[PDB]
From Swiss-Prot, chain A:
Quaternary structure and interacting proteins, as annotated: Complex I is composed of 45 different subunits.
Superkingdom to which the source organism belongs: Eukaryota
Originating species: Bos taurus (Bovine)
Compartments (UniProt record): Mitochondrion inner membrane
Region (Disordered): 27-47
Function: Accessory subunit of the mitochondrial membrane respiratory chain NADH dehydrogenase (Complex I), that is believed not to be involved in catalysis. Complex I functions in the transfer of electrons from NADH to the respiratory chain. The immediate electron acceptor for the enzyme is believed to be ubiquinone.
Portion of the parent chain present: 6 to 57 of 113
Homology family: Belongs to the complex I NDUFA7 subunit family.
Name of protein: NADH dehydrogenase [ubiquinone] 1 alpha subcomplex subunit 7
Bilayer-spanning residue ranges: none
UniProtKB/Swiss-Prot annotation, chain B:
Record lineage: Eukaryota, Metazoa, Chordata, Craniata, Vertebrata
One GO biological process term: mitochondrial respiratory chain complex I assembly
Binding of [4Fe-4S] cluster 1, residues: 96, 100, 103, 109
Binding residues annotated for [2Fe-2S] cluster, in chain numbering: 36, 47, 50, 64
Provenance organism: Bos taurus (Bovine)
Protein name per its UniProtKB record: NADH-ubiquinone oxidoreductase 75 kDa subunit, mitochondrial
Length: 52, 230
């Protein structure tokens, strides 16, 4: 349209990096339930005080 | 004269010939952990928390009830003593329920000021936790006998200073209990003065019961006047 290219003659032409993320391709939600790994020598039979 | 220089962590001190390892190590400004011991009581040893690794010996002894021979090296911090003070105070922290939101000695119990400094980090038990029942004795001693780590400290007090022969030990092995077999009340002089001696919060005060936690008070010393002895 004719109001479009006047934005494209002024200050270059971007058309994609809008100042809103309000449109699509903003991350909406995330589904899965989380579970945390328990790693750093939390286990037994060697993990043992007076060493740490 | 009448002394032995014992190198407590390699440092000389002269005690009487016939004192204890506990009083020797407490003389040089140290604390070994104390459960089955009291100065104002007799001496037993059935908690087995004080365990020091004596030098020139493969074994470990307990500092409560043994004399001191010719001058040893009482090796307090070792790489084996900390394999013992961690060791004993992992068992007795298992067969015990999850109180202290509601345990009324919740700011001063000796499973709570030993367990940060000494001892382990996590648990591996991982199910169990026997649960005995309680009773009532008098209208002064709020009574949860579940916690009751059986340090035999209230028990000897009946044979000690308060001469009322009332309490005993009922049971065998894992299952023993402390309270009176029959439902006889226990009240005389000094009868409310056991709830200081019980080193965990298994015994507490009946009127004081649910009021406030002990980190909010302001301790100011004074004298009571209700008797002539002060
Ligand atoms: S009242 Fe509990 S802590 Fe005190 S001596 Fe008896 S069993 Fe041990
Ligand atoms: S008496 Fe000791 S073990 Fe029992 S709830 Fe209080 S701190 Fe925990
Ligand atoms: S502290 Fe009483 S026996 Fe070790």
């Amino acid at each position: 349209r004719f109001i479009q290219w006047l934005r494209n003659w002024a200050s270059g032409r971007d058309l994609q990096a809008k100042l809103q993320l309000r449109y699509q391709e903003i991350s909406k939600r995330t589904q899965p339930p989380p579970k945390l790994p328990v790693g750093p020598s939390h286990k037994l039979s060697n993990n043992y005080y007076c060493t740490r | 004269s009448n002394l032995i220089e014992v190198f407590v962590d390699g440092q000389s001190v002269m005690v009487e010939p016939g004192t204890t390892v506990l009083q020797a190590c407490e003389k040089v400004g140290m604390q070994i952990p104390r459960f089955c011991y009291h100065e104002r009581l007799s001496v037993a040893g059935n908690c087995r928390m004080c365990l020091v690794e004596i030098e020139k010996a493969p074994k470990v002894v307990a500092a409560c009830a043994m004399p001191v021979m010719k001058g040893w090296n009482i090796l307090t911090n070792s790489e084996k003593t900390k394999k013992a003070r961690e060791g004993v105070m992992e068992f007795l922290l298992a067969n015990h329920p999850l109180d202290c939101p509601i345990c009324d000695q919740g700011g001063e119990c000796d499973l709570q000021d030993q367990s940060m400094m000494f001892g382990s980090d996590r648990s591996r038990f991982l199910e169990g936790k026997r649960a005995v029942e309680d009773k009532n004795i008098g209208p002064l001693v709020k009574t949860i006998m579940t916690r009751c780590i059986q340090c035999t400290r209230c028990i000897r007090f009946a044979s000690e200073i308060a001469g009322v022969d009332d309490l005993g030990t009922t049971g065998r092995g894992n299952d023993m209990q402390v309270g009176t077999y029959i439902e006889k009340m226990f009240m005389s002089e000094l009868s409310g003065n056991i709830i200081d001696i019980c080193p965990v919060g298994a015994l507490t005060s009946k009127p004081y019961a649910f009021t406030a936690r002990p980190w909010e008070t302001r301790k100011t010393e004074s004298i009571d006047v209700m008797d002539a002895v002060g």
